[PDB]
Short mmCIF file of C-alpha atoms (C1' of nucleotides) and ligand atoms in Angstrom, two decimals:
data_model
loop_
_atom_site.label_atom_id
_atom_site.label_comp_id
_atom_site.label_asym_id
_atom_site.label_seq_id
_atom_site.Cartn_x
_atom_site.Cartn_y
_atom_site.Cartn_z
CA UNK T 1 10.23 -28.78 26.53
CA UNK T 2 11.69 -26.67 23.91
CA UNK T 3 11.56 -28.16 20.41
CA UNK T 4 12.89 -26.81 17.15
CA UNK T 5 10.19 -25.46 14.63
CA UNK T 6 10.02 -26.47 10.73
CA UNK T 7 11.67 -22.84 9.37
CA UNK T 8 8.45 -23.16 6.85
CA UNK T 9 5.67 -23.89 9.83
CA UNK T 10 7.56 -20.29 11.25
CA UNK T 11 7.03 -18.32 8.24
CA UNK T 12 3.60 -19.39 8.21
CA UNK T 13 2.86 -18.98 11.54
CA UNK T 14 4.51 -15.43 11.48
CA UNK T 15 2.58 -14.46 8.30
CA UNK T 16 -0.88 -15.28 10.41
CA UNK T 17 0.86 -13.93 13.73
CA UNK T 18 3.61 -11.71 13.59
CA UNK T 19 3.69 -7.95 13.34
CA UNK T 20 6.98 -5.90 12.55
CA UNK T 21 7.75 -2.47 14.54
CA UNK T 22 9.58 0.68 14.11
CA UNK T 23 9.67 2.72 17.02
CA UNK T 24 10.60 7.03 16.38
CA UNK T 25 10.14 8.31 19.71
CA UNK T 26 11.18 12.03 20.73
CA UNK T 27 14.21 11.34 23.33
CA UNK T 28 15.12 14.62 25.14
CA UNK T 29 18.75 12.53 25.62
CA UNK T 30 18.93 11.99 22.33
CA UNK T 31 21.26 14.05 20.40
CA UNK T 32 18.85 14.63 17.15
CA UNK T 33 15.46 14.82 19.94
CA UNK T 34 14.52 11.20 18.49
CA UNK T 35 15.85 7.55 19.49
CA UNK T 36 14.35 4.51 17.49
CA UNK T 37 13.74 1.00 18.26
CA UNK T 38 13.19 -2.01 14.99
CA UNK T 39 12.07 -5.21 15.57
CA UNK T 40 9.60 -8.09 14.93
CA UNK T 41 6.95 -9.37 17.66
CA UNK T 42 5.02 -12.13 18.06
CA UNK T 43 1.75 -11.87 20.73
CA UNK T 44 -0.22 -15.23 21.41
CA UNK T 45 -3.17 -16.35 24.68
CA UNK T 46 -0.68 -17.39 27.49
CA UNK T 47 -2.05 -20.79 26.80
CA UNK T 48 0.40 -21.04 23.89
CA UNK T 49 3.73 -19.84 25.55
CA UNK T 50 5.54 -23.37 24.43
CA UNK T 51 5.40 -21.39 20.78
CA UNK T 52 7.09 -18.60 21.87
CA UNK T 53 9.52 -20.47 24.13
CA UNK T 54 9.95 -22.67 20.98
CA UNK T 55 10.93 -20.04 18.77
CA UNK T 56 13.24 -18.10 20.93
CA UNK T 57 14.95 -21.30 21.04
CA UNK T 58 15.28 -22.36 17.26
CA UNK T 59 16.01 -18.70 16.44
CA UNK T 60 18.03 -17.91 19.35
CA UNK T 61 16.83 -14.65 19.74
CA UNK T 62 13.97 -12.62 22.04
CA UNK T 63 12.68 -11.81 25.22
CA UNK T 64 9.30 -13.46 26.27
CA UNK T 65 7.09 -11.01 28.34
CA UNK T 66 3.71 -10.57 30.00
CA UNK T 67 1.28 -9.08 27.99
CA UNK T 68 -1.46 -7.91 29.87
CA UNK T 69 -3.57 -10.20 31.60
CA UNK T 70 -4.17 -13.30 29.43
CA UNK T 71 -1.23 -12.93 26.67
CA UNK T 72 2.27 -13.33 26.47
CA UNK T 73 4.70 -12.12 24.23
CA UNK T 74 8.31 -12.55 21.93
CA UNK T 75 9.37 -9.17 21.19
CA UNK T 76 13.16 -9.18 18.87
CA UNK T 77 14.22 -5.21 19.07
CA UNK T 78 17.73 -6.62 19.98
CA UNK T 79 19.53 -5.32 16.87
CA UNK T 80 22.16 -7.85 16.59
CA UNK T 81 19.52 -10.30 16.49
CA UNK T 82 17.40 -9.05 13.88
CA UNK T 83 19.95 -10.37 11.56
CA UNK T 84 18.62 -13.91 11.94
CA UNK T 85 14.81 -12.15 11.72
CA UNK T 86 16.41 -11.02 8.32
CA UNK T 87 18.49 -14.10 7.28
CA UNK T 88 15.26 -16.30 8.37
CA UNK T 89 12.97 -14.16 5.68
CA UNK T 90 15.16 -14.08 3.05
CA UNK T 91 15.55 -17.81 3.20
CA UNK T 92 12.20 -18.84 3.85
CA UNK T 93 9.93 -15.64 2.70
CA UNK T 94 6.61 -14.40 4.18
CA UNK T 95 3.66 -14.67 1.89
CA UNK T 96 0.77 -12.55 3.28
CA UNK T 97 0.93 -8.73 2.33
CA UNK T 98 2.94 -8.92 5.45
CA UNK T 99 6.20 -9.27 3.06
CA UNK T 100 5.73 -5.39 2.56
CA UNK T 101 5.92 -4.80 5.79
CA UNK T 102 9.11 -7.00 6.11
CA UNK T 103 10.41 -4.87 3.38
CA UNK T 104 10.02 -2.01 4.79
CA UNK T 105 11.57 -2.89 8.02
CA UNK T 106 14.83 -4.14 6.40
CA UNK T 107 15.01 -0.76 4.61
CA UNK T 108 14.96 0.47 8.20
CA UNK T 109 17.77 -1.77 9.38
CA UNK T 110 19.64 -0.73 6.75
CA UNK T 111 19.14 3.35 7.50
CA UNK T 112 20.41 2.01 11.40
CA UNK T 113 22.90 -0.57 10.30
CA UNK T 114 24.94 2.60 8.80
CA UNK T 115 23.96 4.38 12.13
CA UNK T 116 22.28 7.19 10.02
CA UNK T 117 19.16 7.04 12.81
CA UNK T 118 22.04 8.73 14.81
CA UNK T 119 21.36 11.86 11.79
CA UNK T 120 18.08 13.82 11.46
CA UNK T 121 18.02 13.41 7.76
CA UNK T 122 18.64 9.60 8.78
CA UNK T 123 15.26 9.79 11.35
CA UNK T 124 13.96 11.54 8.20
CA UNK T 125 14.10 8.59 6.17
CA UNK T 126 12.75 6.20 9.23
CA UNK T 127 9.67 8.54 8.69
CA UNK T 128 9.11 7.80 5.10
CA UNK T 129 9.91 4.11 5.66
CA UNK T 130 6.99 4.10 8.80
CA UNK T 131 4.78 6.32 6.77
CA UNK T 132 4.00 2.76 4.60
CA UNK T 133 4.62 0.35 7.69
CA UNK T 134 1.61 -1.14 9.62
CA UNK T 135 -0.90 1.61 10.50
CA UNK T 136 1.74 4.67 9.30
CA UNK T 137 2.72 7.98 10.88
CA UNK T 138 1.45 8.36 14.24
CA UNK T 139 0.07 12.09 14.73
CA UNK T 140 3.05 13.48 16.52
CA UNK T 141 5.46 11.93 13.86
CA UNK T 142 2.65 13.69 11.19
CA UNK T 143 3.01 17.44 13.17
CA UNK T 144 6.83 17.10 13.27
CA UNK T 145 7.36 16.05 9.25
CA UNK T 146 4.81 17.91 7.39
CA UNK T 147 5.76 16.28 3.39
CA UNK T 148 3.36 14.60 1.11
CA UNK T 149 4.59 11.10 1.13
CA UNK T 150 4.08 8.38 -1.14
CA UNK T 151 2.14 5.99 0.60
CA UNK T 152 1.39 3.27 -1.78
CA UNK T 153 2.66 -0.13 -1.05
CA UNK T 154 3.99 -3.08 -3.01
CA UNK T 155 0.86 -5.41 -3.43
CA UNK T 156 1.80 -8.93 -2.58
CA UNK T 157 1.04 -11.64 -5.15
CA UNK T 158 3.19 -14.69 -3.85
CA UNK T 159 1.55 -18.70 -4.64
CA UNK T 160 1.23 -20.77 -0.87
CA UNK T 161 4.65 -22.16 -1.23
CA UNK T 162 4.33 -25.51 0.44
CA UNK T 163 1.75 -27.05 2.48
CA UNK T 164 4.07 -26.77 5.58
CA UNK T 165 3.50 -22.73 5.28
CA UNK T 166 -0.13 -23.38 5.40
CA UNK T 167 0.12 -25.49 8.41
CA UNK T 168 1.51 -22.90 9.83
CA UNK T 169 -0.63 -19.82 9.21
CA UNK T 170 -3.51 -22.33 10.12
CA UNK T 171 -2.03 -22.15 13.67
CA UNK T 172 -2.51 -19.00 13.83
CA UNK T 173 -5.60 -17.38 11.85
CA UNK T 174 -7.32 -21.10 12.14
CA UNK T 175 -10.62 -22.39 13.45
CA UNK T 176 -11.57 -25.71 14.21
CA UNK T 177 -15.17 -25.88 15.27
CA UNK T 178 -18.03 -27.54 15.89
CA UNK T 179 -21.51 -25.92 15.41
CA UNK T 180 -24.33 -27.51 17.08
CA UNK T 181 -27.55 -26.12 15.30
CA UNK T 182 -30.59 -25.96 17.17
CA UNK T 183 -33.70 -28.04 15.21
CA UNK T 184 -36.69 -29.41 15.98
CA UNK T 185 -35.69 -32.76 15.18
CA UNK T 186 -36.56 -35.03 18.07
CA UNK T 187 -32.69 -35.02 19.09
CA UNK T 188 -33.40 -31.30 18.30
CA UNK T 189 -29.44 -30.43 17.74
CA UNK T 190 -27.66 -31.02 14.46
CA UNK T 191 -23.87 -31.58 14.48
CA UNK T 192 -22.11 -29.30 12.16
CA UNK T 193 -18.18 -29.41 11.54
CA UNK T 194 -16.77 -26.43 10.09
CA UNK T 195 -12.85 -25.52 9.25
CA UNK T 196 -12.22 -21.47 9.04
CA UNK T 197 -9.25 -19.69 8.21
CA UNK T 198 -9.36 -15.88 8.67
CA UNK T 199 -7.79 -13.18 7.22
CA UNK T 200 -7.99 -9.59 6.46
CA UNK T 201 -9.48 -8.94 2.88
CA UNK T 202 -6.26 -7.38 1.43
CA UNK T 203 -5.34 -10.64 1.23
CA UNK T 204 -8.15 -12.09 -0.58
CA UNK T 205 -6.17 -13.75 -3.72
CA UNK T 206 -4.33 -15.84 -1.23
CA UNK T 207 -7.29 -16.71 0.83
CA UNK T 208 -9.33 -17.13 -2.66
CA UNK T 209 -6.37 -19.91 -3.27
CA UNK T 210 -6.96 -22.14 -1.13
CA UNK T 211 -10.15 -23.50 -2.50
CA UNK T 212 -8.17 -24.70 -5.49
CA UNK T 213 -4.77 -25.90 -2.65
CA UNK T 214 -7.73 -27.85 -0.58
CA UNK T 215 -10.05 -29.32 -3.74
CA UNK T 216 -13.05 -28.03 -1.02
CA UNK T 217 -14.85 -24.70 0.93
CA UNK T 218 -15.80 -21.28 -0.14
CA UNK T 219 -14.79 -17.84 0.55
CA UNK T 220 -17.71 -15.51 3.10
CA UNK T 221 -17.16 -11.78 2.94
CA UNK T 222 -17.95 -10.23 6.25
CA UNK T 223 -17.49 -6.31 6.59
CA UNK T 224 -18.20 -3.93 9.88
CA UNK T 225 -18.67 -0.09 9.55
CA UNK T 226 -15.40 0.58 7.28
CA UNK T 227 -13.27 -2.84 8.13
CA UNK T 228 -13.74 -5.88 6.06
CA UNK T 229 -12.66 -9.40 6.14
CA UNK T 230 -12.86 -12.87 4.94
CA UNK T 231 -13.24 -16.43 6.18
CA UNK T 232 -12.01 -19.61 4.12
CA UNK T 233 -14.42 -22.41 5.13
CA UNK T 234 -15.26 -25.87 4.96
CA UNK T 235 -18.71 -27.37 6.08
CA UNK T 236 -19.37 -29.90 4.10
CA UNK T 237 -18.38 -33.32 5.60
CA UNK T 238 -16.87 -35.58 3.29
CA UNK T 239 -14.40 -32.69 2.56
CA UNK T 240 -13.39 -32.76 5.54
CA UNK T 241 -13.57 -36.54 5.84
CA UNK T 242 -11.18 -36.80 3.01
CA UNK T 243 -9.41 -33.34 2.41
CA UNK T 244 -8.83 -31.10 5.70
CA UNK T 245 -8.12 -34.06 8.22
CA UNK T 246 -6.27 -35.71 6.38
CA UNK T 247 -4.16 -32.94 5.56
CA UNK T 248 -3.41 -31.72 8.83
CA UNK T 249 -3.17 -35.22 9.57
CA UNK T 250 -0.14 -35.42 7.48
CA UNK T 251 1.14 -31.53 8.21
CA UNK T 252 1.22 -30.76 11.59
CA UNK T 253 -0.25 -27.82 13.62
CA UNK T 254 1.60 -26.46 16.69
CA UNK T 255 0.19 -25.08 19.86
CA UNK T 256 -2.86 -25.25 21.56
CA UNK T 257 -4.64 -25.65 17.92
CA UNK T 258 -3.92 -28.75 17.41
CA UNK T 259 -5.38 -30.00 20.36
CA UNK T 260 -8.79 -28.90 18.71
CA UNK T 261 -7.84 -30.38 15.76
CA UNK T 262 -7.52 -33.54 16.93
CA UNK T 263 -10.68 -33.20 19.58
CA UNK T 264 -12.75 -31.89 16.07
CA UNK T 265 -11.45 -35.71 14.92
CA UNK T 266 -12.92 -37.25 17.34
CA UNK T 267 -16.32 -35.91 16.90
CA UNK T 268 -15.82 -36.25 13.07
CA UNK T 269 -15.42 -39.91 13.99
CA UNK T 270 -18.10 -40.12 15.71
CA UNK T 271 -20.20 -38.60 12.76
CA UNK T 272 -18.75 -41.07 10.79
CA UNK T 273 -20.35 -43.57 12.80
CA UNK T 274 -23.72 -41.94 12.68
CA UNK T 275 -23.47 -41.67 16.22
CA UNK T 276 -24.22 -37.93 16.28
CA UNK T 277 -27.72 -39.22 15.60
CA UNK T 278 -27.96 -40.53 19.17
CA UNK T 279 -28.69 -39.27 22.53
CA UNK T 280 -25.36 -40.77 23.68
CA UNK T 281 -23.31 -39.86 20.89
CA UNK T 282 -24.75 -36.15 21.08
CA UNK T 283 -23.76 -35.86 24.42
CA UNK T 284 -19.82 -36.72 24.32
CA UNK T 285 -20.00 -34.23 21.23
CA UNK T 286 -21.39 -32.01 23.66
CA UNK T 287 -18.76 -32.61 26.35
CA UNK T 288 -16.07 -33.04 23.74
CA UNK T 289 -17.30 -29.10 22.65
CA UNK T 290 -17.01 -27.94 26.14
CA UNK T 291 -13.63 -28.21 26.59
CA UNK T 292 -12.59 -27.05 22.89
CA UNK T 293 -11.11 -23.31 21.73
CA UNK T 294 -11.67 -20.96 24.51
CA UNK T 295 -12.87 -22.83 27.11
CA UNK T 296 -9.97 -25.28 27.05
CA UNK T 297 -8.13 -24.70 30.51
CA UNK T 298 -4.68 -26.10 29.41
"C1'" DG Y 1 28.23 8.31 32.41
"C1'" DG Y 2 25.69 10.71 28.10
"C1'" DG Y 3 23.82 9.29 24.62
"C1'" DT Y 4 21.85 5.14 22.94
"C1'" DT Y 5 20.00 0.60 23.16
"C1'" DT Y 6 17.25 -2.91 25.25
"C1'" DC Y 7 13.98 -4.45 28.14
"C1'" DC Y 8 9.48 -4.87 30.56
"C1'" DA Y 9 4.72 -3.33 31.92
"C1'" DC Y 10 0.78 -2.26 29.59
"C1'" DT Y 11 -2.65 -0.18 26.06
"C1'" DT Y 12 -5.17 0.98 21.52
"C1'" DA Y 13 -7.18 -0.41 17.21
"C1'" DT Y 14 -9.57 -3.41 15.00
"C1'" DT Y 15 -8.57 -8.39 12.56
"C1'" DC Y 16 -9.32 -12.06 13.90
"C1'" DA Y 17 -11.25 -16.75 15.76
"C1'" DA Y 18 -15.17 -18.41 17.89
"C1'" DC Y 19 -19.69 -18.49 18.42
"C1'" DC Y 20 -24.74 -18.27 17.03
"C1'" DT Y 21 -29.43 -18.94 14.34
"C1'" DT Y 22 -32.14 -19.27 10.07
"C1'" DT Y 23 -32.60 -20.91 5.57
"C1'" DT Y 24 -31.68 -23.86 1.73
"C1'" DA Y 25 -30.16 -28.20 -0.50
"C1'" DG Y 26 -30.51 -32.93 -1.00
"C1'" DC Z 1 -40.31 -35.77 6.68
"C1'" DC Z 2 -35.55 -36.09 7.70
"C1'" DT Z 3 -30.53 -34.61 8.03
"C1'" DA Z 4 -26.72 -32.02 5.88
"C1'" DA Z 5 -24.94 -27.94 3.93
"C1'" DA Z 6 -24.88 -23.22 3.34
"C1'" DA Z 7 -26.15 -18.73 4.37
"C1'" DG Z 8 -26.11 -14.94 7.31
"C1'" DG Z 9 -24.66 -13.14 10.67
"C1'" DT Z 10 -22.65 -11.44 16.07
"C1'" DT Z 11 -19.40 -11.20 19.88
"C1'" DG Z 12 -15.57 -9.31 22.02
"C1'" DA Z 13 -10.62 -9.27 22.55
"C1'" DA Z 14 -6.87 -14.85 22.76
"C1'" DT Z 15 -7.16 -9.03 17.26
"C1'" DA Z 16 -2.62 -6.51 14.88
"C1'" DA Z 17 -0.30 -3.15 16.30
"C1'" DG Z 18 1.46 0.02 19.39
"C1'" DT Z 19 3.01 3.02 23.90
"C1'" DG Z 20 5.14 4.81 28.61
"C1'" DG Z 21 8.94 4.33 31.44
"C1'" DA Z 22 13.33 3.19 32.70
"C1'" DA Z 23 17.16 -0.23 33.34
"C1'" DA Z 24 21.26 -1.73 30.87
"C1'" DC Z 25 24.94 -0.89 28.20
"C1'" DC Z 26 29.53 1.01 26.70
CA1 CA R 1 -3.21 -12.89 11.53
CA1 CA R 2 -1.62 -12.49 17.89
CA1 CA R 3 -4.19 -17.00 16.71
CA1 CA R 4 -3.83 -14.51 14.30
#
DNA sequence: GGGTTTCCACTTATTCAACCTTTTAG
DNA sequence: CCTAAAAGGTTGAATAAGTGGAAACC
C-alpha cells in the first residue's frame, strides 16, 4: 500500500540511510576509456521494502532491487531523475555531514549535465569531485590521476531543523530496546528500557544536540582499532515516560521501527504498573522481547 | 548500432543497531 | 537490602558504500 512520505521524515531518513554514488569506470566502448554513472541509493533489511516502495512512489523515481540475501534496495542513477533527488535537497536539506556529500554530487551533475563526462578533462574533474566523496579515489582511479588533491571537506554545522527530521533519522540509525539485566534478586532479571540513536563520530555536535532537543540521555563514545562512534541514549525511565514516548508518540516513525516502538510501549506500560516486578509481568516482557528488532519475522 | 546510459546481481568496508554483563546511584 | 540507572562493553552485518556484467537506449 504505497503511501506518500512527509518530504522532512525523507530527509531524515536519508541523512541516517542514504548514501550518494559516483561511478568512473574504465569503458573500452567509451570514447575517452571511462563511462560514469551519479546517483543516490538507499539499502534497508527486506523487512522494510514498504519504505522503499514508498519513496519511489512520492518521488517518482528508482528501481527497487535485491540486495543480497536479506536486503533490498532503491538505487536513482536515472539521470533525468536525479533532478527531483536535487530539487528534493535543495528544498528540504540534509543535515548530517552527509550534505557534503550531496554537494559534491551536484557538482558532478553539473560536470554531466553539460555532457563534459563525455571529455577527459571533464572525467578529470569527476576525479577531483570523487576524491572528497564517500570513501574517495579508488586505487585504479589513484594509478590513472597521479595529482595532489585537496581533500578537505566542508564540515557540516546545520541545527535539527524540525522534529519531523528527527523522526526520521530515528528510523533509520534508531534503537528501541529492552535490556533485561541478570541479578540476583529473587525475580533475578531487572527490566531496563533504553532509546539509542547511532551515528558516526564526525557527527558528534549533532548527536551532542539532542540532549538539549530531548531535555534527557547522554552521549557514550565507543571506538574499535581506528573507527569510532557514538550512541545518543536514554535509560532512565521517567524520561522516557515523559520525553521519548511521547515524542514519537506525537512524530511518527516509519517502517518496521515503529513496530518496536510501540511493542517498547507496551512494556514501558507495564513498568508503569510495577508489573515488571512480577513473575507474570516478567514473562510477557519476555515474550514481548522475543519478537522485537531482529527476531521480528514480519 | 557505437557509444553511452541504465539496470540488476552481488560484494567490500566498516557504521551501525542490537545485544550483553558489571558496577554505581538512589 | 532492594530496584533503577549508568557504565562498559561485544557482536556481526539488517553497516555505508561500492563493484562486475550486460541489457536498453537512441
Ligand atoms: Ca546511518
Ligand atoms: Ca542502510
Ligand atoms: Ca537502519
Ligand atoms: Ca542506518
Amino acid at each position: 500500500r504505497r503511501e506518500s512520505i512527509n518530504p522532512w521524515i525523507l530527509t531524515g531518513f536519508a541523512d541516517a540511510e542514504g548514501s550518494f554514488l559516483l561511478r568512473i569506470r574504465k569503458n573500452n566502448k567509451s570514447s575517452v576509456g571511462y563511462s560514469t554513472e551519479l546517483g543516490f541509493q538507499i539499502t534497508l533489511h527486506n523487512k522494510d521494502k514498504s519504505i522503499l516502495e514508498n519513496i519511489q512512489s512520492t518521488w517518482g523515481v528508482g528501481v527497487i532491487a535485491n540486495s543480497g540475501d536479506n536486503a533490498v534496495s532503491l538505487k536513482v542513477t536515472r539521470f533525468e531523475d536525479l533532478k527531483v533527488i536535487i530539487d528534493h535537497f535543495e528544498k528540504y536539506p540534509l543535515i548530517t555531514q552527509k550534505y557534503a556529500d550531496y554537494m559534491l554530487f551536484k557538482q558532478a551533475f553539473n560536470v554531466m549535465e553539460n555532457k563534459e563526462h563525455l571529455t577527459i578533462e571533464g572525467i578529470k574533474e569527476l576525479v577531483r569531485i570523487k576524491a572528497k566523496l564517500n570513501w574517495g579515489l579508488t586505487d585504479e582511479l589513484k594509478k590513472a590521476f597521479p595529482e595532489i588533491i585537496s581533500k578537505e571537506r566542508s564540515l557540516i554545522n546545520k541545527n535539527i531543523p524540525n522534529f519531523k527530521w528527527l523522526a526520521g533519522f530515528t528510523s533509520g540509525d534508531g534503537c528501541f530496546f529492552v535490556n533485561l539485566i541478570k541479578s540476583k534478586s529473587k525475580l533475578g532479571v531487572q527490566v531496563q528500557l533504553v532509546f539509542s540513536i547511532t551515528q558516526h563520530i564526525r557527527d558528534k555536535n549533532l548527536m551532542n544536540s539532542l540532549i538539549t532537543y530531548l531535555g534527557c540521555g547522554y552521549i557514550k563514545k565507543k571506538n574499535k582499532s581506528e573507527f569510532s562512534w557514538l550512541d545518543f541514549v536514554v535509560t532512565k525511565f521517567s524520561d522516557i515516560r515523559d520525553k521519548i514516548i511521547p515524542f514519537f508518540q506525537e512524530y511518527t516513525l516509519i517502517g518496521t521501527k515503529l513496530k518496536d516502538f510501540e511493542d517498547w510501549c507496551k512494556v514501558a506500560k507495564l513498568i508503569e504498573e510495577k508489573k515488571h516486578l512480577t513473575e507474570e509481568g516478567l514473562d510477557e516482557i519476555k515474550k514481548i522481547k522475543l519478537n522485537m528488532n531482529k527476531g521480528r519475522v514480519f
